[PDB]
A paper describes a structure:
The salivary scavenger and agglutinin (SALSA), also known as gp340, “deleted in malignant brain tumors 1” (DMBT1) and salivary agglutinin (SAG), is a multifunctional molecule found in high abundance on human mucosal surfaces. SALSA has widespread functions in innate immunity, inflammation, epithelial homeostasis, and tumour suppression. The first 13 SRCRs are 109 aa domains found as “pearls on a string” separated by SRCR-interspersed domains (SIDs). The SALSA SRCR domains reveal a classic globular SRCR-fold, with four conserved disulphide bridges, as described for the SRCR type B domains.
SRCR domains 1 and 8 (SRCR1 and SRCR8) were expressed in Drosophila melanogaster Schneider S2 cells with a C-terminal His-tag. The domains were purified by Ni-chelate and size-exclusion chromatography (SEC) and crystallised, and the structures were solved by molecular replacement. This yielded the structures of SRCR1 and SRCR8 at 1.77 and 1.29 Å, respectively. The fold contains one α-helix and one additional single helical turn. The N and C termini come together in a four-stranded β-sheet. Combined, the data from SRCR1 and SRCR8 are thus valid representations of all SALSA SRCR domains. Both SRCR1 and SRCR8 are stabilized by a metal ion buried in the globular fold. The placement suggests the ion is bound during the folding of the domain and is modelled as Mg2+, which is present in the original expression medium and in the crystallisation conditions of SRCR1.
Author numbering: 99 to 207
């Protein structure tokens, strides 16, 4: 069962992006980690909208195989794994590129 979390931030609605894929939490190393991408993360978590998308392991480096690399959300999607992307677990990037998000945390549902 796919799941998403933001870790090592100040609260549920900010931190390093991690996706539960086939039993292990994996990070995102997108070098075009954009507002549209972050907005999808925030919507999916019920965390409002993306105030910023901190880059390059701002919230620290994750560990283990990296789940997603080039994720190109339109910005409307309900889940990050619904955005166009260039594959699971097939990436040469390092955890120094792990993406992060800071959401408004203005959701109530
Ligand atoms: Cl980051
Ligand atoms: Mg992107």
């Amino acid at each position: 069962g796919l799941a998403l979390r933001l870790v090592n931030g100040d609260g549920r609605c900010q931190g390093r992006v991690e996706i539960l894929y086939r039993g292990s939490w994996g990070t995102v190393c997108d070098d075009s980690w954009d507002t549209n991408d972050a907005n999808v993360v925030c919507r999916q978590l019920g965390c409002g909208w993306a105030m910023s998308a901190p880059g390059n392991a701002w919230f620290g480096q994750g560990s283990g195989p990296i789940a997603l690399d080039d994720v190109r959300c339109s910005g409307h999607e309900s889940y990050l794994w619904s955005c166009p992307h260039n594959g699971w677990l097939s990436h040469n990037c390092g955890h120094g590129e792990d993406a992060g998000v800071i959401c408004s945390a203005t959701g109530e549902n």
